Amino acid sequence: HMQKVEVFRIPTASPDDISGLATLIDSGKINPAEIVAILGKTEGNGCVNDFTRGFATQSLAMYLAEKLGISREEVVKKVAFIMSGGTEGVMTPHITVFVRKDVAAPAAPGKRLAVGVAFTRDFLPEELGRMEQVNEVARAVKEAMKDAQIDDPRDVHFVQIKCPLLTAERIEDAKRRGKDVVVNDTYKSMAYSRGASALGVALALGEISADKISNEAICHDWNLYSSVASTSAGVELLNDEIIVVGNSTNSASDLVIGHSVMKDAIDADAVRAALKDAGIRSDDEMDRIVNVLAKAEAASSGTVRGRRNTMLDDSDINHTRSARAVVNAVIASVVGDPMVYVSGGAEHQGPDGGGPIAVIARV
Amino acid sequence: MQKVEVFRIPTASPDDISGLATLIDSGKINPAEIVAILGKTEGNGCVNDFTRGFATQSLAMYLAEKLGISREEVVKKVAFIMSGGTEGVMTPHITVFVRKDVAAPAAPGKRLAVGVAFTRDFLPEELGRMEQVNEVARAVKEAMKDAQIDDPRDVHFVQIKCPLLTAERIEDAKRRGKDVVVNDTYKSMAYSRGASALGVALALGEISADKISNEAICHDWNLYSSVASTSAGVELLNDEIIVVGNSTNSASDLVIGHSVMKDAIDADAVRAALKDAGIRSDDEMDRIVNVLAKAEAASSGTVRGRRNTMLDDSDINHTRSARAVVNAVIASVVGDPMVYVSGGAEHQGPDGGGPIAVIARV
Amino acid sequence: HMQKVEVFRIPTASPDDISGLATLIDSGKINPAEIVAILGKTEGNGCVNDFTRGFATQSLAMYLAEKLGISREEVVKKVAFIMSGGTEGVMTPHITVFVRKDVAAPPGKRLAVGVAFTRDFLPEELGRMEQVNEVARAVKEAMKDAQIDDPRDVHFVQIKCPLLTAERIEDAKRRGKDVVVNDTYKSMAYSRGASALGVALALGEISADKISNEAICHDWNLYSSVASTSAGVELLNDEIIVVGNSTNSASDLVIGHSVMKDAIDADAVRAALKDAGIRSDDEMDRIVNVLAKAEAASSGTVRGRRNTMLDDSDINHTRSARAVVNAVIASVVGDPMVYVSGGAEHQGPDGGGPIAVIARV
Amino acid sequence: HMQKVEVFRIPTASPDDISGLATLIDSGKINPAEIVAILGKTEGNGCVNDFTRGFATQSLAMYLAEKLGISREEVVKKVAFIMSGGTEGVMTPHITVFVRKDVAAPAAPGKRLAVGVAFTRDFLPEELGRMEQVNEVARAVKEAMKDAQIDDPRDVHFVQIKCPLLTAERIEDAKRRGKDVVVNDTYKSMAYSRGASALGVALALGEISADKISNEAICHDWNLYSSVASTSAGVELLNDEIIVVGNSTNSASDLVIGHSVMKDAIDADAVRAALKDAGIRSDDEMDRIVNVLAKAEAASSGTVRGRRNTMLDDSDINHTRSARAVVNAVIASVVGDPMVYVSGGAEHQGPDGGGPIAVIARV
Ligand SMILES: Oc1nc(O)nc(O)n1
Ligand SMILES: Oc1nc(O)nc(O)n1
Ligand SMILES: [Ca+2]
Ligand SMILES: [Ca+2]
Ligand SMILES: [Ca+2]
Ligand SMILES: [Ca+2]
Ligand SMILES: [Cl-]
Ligand SMILES: [Cl-]
Ligand SMILES: [Cl-]
């Protein structure tokens, strides 16, 4: 009959903590068969050797499989598990659980929150950071929009993707097959994977025309970007998982989503603009926030508003860790809550040094 | 007639003196009137941060050549306070304080003023205890007088350089038969910072003397100063007090105001400090000379009821994270990450918070 | 009454990699019901916020439970899972699987293994006499499980023990209790140290009248020469594996040990090999694994030469100590896939640590 | 014409500690006017943002200038200052001071320690890791051999070089000038600068023919390497500084140098081979060591002897920090002393995963 999306932001005590989700299931507030996606902030380093992402997915998949009486492998085929590592600064570990119920009710007036999920095929290592990833992601984004019953791309406000990275072993498998990889470096491969995935969002939504996107433009032409893509790389998968979040005229959700784009890492004005776009017009209405979701990164210029910083020179602390701490702190200072989703590395996601920011709010 | 000038100077590296040299070579700064240099240097801001000494050496070398004295004398004449750690978007820079007496008339009100005072040297067993507290309090009174400030409510930022305890000083304490406050050189810094900060609060009436004892030091976190900013040093044995405030008798074109961050994300306190310094709208933000704040990880492991990993993160020291967060918050209010944020905030603001001062053009 | 111990050192590709173990099970080399302990090196940071330890245990427990037709909870009650994080330098992630079976074969002493667990500890008990005394009780139980009655026949006592987090310190405070130290990284040292003194108490290496709360992590002249202790967020009790030789053993393996006097003491590595029957480089192929403790000396030096391990705010000293000692061992035996664990409080002298070798006879 | 070289390995308490050197000057054992080079291990992180290197050089240059009655600027023009950061593991901070003077003395008669020094021109950021750096380094190595009175490249046993790196500001400036740098990554720029400099050595010594070296080979063809090159990058200089160390028939030194090549990071055999090449035939004779100098690195394969390690995957600790800790520990365990010189990053310095190792010893 009618889609109704409920979103639960759940504090976690550890990557493997399923207790808050279990409380909501046990109380009858979540039917686990209606979960379609879980988006986590896990407390690993959010870079290459972050195993909290996999640990969190395994733990949730094992728990839900037992609850649902199905195998873990069926759970991971059915539910998107997108775990973004790195909870630096004051950023609080948590998961955001997306539930799509089928209700009898009519659609609420206007446009209300809608979510769609799509998975791509697995990518050969030589496809990462290249047009094969771009185009396959684009196809999956359009599929997820249809899942969400969003026709108009302007009603898409956040597209969250988990994507792969290159391991030493995967690079070796490509060269054994006579193939070269976009970059011979696992950490840099995260940026190419993130960037190609974000451009696929842009292509699917009509934010960028197809004839402007080529292999040579990926992670080079920062004039090209999506205003809603949020992409995250990890070792624990070989394809891209896509969650489209937007508003549909055919939805019974008591929620909406809105967004803006941070022009740089300290752009609080963009945080307030994203809150306003989600219907939050005053400080007292911030208790309607369900979550804030944003991308953060170090600007290639090595500066913010003409002021130097050491993020790209600091050999002790990787720059995506620093960018996550900063943007989370800025958002937290606006909304009074550090338990918000901030993901680092914003290649072709907002301008160079900035990133999209979305707000899911109660109506 | 007292006049204080303040120059916030971006730096390209710990040893970069070009910005300061430019202002000296143009006549805008006379090196003889420099009383203090407050630096953010881009090392890790923790134990093995050599950028603090590198920056001090580089500045002392340059200023000793320009004043014709030795760098040993320069370090005695000028207070070098180097706070390492430029995490997140925090921009390395130095802030140079110049104090001169000019022949201009009275102040149209109260204007920026600085005073300085020194304590006696502290026997190792005296650090972290009422001896240091009480002596620091006297010194603040002297510096207030030196600044020509007679209302404590006109003190807005009290820089202190305070000593610590070393092994040779540990043995000197048992060579006399008396133990020290703590059997650790790292914690002695936190006990020295806290004691000196409580001495500030005592001197200014921020807390009643009846509440301060050796047992409350670094335990009674409800006791704190709202203006003290302390840093533990290896070279001095006394306390170096620099009072910054507003005096009715000053020719400065600058004022100082302050507030207290109740926690690491308290942007409300940042705006209050700005308003206390005469910046009442986003349009007037260009009048900022610098913002000076303290950051620290809350002992509870939480901010506004939300857990964070600062105290559990074995890869990144928690003081580095606290500095990144507070810098980011202030920068998002003022639009400029080139502000001074230091760590180590015992009895400086509440647990998990810290004082925040703003120096602004009139 | 006759037990035979088999030990498999298995390279891993990630913390959750069970494929090498599954291969040994599917080939019939390991009956999974006979597994009694797994000792891993997992590739997290080996400090407080290392979740690779828990990830590895969870993955092994899930796999074994499915293979055995029992619950994960029953598996973790039956099998010791001790995951030591930190694979710094060239140290190679792997697991060591201990299998023990009853056999009927009929001189001399051969490898014996025993396992015991303690009760869970309250945060305010870590690093204090309650942990020492409960560990000591469990060590004696593990010795009986190993059928070792003479403490001189115990060559390595491997323990996993808890640590403090900020959240657990707050729990303690809310209950009106003070913890032994408020620094979460230093809490690992107190848990390791109290656990190691519990070994020394149980084995008679130190008398009880010499152990008190005030000695724990202060009197470095108190130590066990066989204790090897490892802390992690993933458990709230202590798990013990006693490894030694017994006359009631039909194993084709033996264990020997020595003590490294400092982090570069290759002579001690060669003495541990010789104690395990490996008399020359030409016999190194009989090594099953080498197991060692490493640490920064409290003096900040090695043979009078200063180092920065205790002063380095970017890299904790147990990470550096593990890289160093693994490198030294690897350069002697030609193989970096050996077990090295950092933090050797009351485990060998200040700056050193026990080192054991399991070898084919 | 006889040159006498003396070498003093001096423990340090901090990067700025000159007290050990001053003691030797004040006792008359060192004439400061005869210092030609100082090779240091300084206790910063050895990567991009290591300011202990420049702090040590500034401190040493200021001390020597006041001792010699000349300007700091003139001290740095006359004395090579090569500060290698990173004192990980048990590696002990120290400096090695090379004193060289002409002497009226008789034959050796064997070959004895010889040292030469040369400096290149400053490089533009866009010249680093490219043939401009290779070729200018090669010219300087030839000049330094001549200064050392070595005409037979087989009598060269160690060629120590300090070279530049790229920072974010230098990369961005290059972009504003319309110029592309060899790599857009500050940490990786160190590898390209070390590697080009090392191929400069191989070209100069005839270890590799010029026709095999091109931009495309640099940090790509690991079959190309020098067996005596030791290169070290730093933020604190814009040129390359070269110290050639070998033995000469025209030397009156009481010291000799020998070398070998570590095949991998745990090759203690090569440590013993280098000792033997320096005349140290047993443990009894290790009291004749003046210093041991070695290059260390992570192998591109991510393994040692077929065994995986995480050096290339660890986003928390850069691989050159790990490699230095490992190789210093191996050497210390052979010679019983961790106060030896180990530099990380051995691109075209020994095979992939290994590096040269030299021993300076009393005869
Ligand atoms: O990753 C990176 N990119 C740019 O443009 N500059 C530096 O220094 N690092
Ligand atoms: O300063 C320095 N040290 C080391 O070990 N390697 C480089 O490239 N630079
Ligand atoms: Ca962006
Ligand atoms: Ca405070
Ligand atoms: Ca020990
Ligand atoms: Ca090499
Ligand atoms: Cl001014
Ligand atoms: Cl940070
Ligand atoms: Cl505090």
CATH number for the domain harbouring residue D15: 3.30.1330.170
User: Are B129 and B64 in a shared domain?
Assistant: no
Residue-by-residue DSSP string for B85-113: ---TTPPPEEEEEEEEE------SS-EEE
CA C255 – CA C339 distance, rounded (Å): 14
Residues D80 and D154 in one domain: no
Run of H or E including D331: helix D319-335
Residues of B in contact with A90 (CB under 8 A): 264-265, 303, 306, 308, 310, 321, 325
Contact C115, C240 (CB under 8 A): yes
Q: Residue A224, Cα to own-chain centre: how many angstroms?
A: 19
| Phi, psi of B267, rounded to the nearest 5 degrees | -70, -25
Residue with tokens 């910083």: A309
Ligand nearest to the CA of A321: 8
- Of all ligands present, the nearest one to the C-alpha of D351 is 6
Same domain? For C7 and C75 the reply is: yes
Residue nearest to atom 5 of ligand 1 (CA): A300
Which of C217, C251, C285 is the last residue in one of the domains? C251
Q: Quick one: tokens of C328?
A: 């030294």
Give the C-alpha separation, C7 to C289, whole Å.
Answer: 9
D344 CA: distance to closest CA in chain B (Å): 20
Supply φ then ψ for residue C151, to 5 degrees: -60, -20
C-beta of A65 in contact with ligand 1 (< 6 A): no
Question: How far is ligand 9, taken at its centre, from the CA of residue B297, in Å?
Answer: 8
Binding residues of C for Mg(2+): 295, 344, 347-349, 352
User: What is the span of the domain harbouring residue A322?
Assistant: 254-363
Instruction: Report whether residue D171 contacts ligand 1, using a CB cutoff of 6 Å.
Output: yes
Q: Give me ligand 8 centre to Cα B50, in Å.
A: 19
D90 touches chain C (CB under 8 A): yes
> How far away, in angstroms, is B312 Cα from ligand 4 center?
19
- Residue in A with minimal Cα distance to C87: A49
Task: Give me the residues paired with residue B258 across strands.
Answer: B357
The β-bridge relationship of strands D35-42 and D80-85 is parallel
Judge whether B296 is annotated as a binding position: yes
Residues D349, D352, D354, D355: what is their CA dihedral angle, to the nearest 10 degrees? 0
- Residue A210 and residue A135: Cα distance in Å, rounded? 9
Cβ-Cβ contacts under 8 Å for B233 (sequence gap 6 or more) = B161, B162, B163, B164
Is the C-alpha dihedral spanning C136, C141, C142, C148 positive or negative?
Answer: positive
Beta strands in chain C (DSSP E): 2-11, 35-42, 80-85, 94-103, 110-117, 154-161, 227-231, 239-246, 253-260, 287-294, 301-302, 305-306, 339-342, 353-360
Q: Regarding beta strands A35-42 and A94-103, do their DSSP bridges make them parallel or antiparallel, or are they unpaired?
A: antiparallel
D223: CA distance to ligand 6 center in Å? 9
**What is the distance in angstroms between the Cα of C85 and the nearest Cα belonging to chain A?**
12
Which site among C47, C48, C262, C264 would you substitute to test the D interface, given the most D Cβ atoms closer than 10 Å to its Cβ? C264
- Does D44 lie at the interface with C, CB-CB under 8 angstroms? no
- In the DSSP assignment, the letter for residue D249 is T
Question: Does C40 lie at the interface with A, CB-CB under 8 angstroms?
Answer: no
Q: Which residue of B has its CA nearest to A270?
A: B332
Residues C56 and C190 in one domain: no
**Residues A200, A166 share a domain:** yes
Neighbour-count burial for B46-55, b at 16+ CB within 10 Å, e otherwise: bebbbbbbbb
Is the minimum CB–CB distance between A44 and chain C shorter than 8 Å? Answer: yes
Q: Which residues pair with C96 in a beta bridge?
A: C9, C39
Are D271 and D242 members of one domain? no
For the CA of A313, the closest atom of ligand 1 is 8
- Active-site positions of B read 161, 231
Interface list for D 179-208 with C (CB within 8 A)? none
Q: What is the CATH number of the domain that holds B257?
A: 3.30.1330.160
Identity of the residue in B91, B265, B325 whose CB atom sits nearest the CB atom of A307: B91
Beta-carbon neighbour count of residue D303 at 10 Å? 19
Ligand nearest to the CA of D349: 6
- Same-domain check for residues B188 and B318: no
Output helix, strand, coil percentages for chain D, rounded to the nearest 5.
35, 25, 40
The response to whether residue D185 sits with its C-beta less than 6 Å from ligand 1 reads yes
Q: Would you tell me how many other CB atoms lie within 10 Å of the CB of residue B304?
A: 18
The verdict on a CB contact (< 8 Å) between B49 and C313 is yes
CA-based radius of gyration for chain D: 19
Beta bridge partners of A112: A248
Interface contact B54, partner D, CB < 8 A = yes
Count how many residues are written for chain C.
361
Q: Which two tokens stand for residue C204?
A: 């008679």
* Domains held by chain B: number: 3
Tokens of B299: 């002992």
Strands laid side by side in the A241-248 sheet: A112-119, A241-248, A156-163, A229-233
Same domain, D243 and D327: no
Active site residues of D: 162, 232
Together in a domain, B223 and B297: no
| C-beta A184 within 6 A of ligand 1 | no
Residue D72: count other Cβ atoms within 10 Å of its Cβ: 17
CA pair distance A45, A64, nearest whole angstrom: 26
Domain closes at, from C251, C272, C292: C251
Residue C144 near chain D (CB below 8 Å): no
Asked if B129 and B66 sit in the same domain, the reply is no
In chain C, what residues touch A43 (CB-CB under 8 Å)? 49, 51
User: Cα of B222 to ligand 9 centre, how many Å?
Assistant: 10
Chain A touched by D318 (CB under 8 Å): yes
- For atom 8 of ligand 1, the residue with the nearest CA is D168
Q: Is B348 annotated as a binding residue?
A: yes
Contact predicate C178/C172, CB 8 Å: yes
Residue A72: exposure state from Cβ atoms within 10 A (0-12, 13-18, ≥19): middle
What letter would DSSP give residue B236? -
Element (H, E) at B191: helix B185-204
C-alpha closest to that of C168 among C155, C152, C180, C154: C180
Distance CA A272, CA A270 (A): 5
CA distance C216 to C205: 15
Q: Are residues A249 and A117 in the same domain?
A: yes
Does residue A244 share a domain with residue A125? yes
> What are the start-end ranges of the H helices in A149-219?
168-176, 186-205
**End position of a domain, from candidates B59, B88, B106:** B106
Q: What spatial distance separates the first Cα and last Cα of chain B, rounded to whole Å?
A: 18
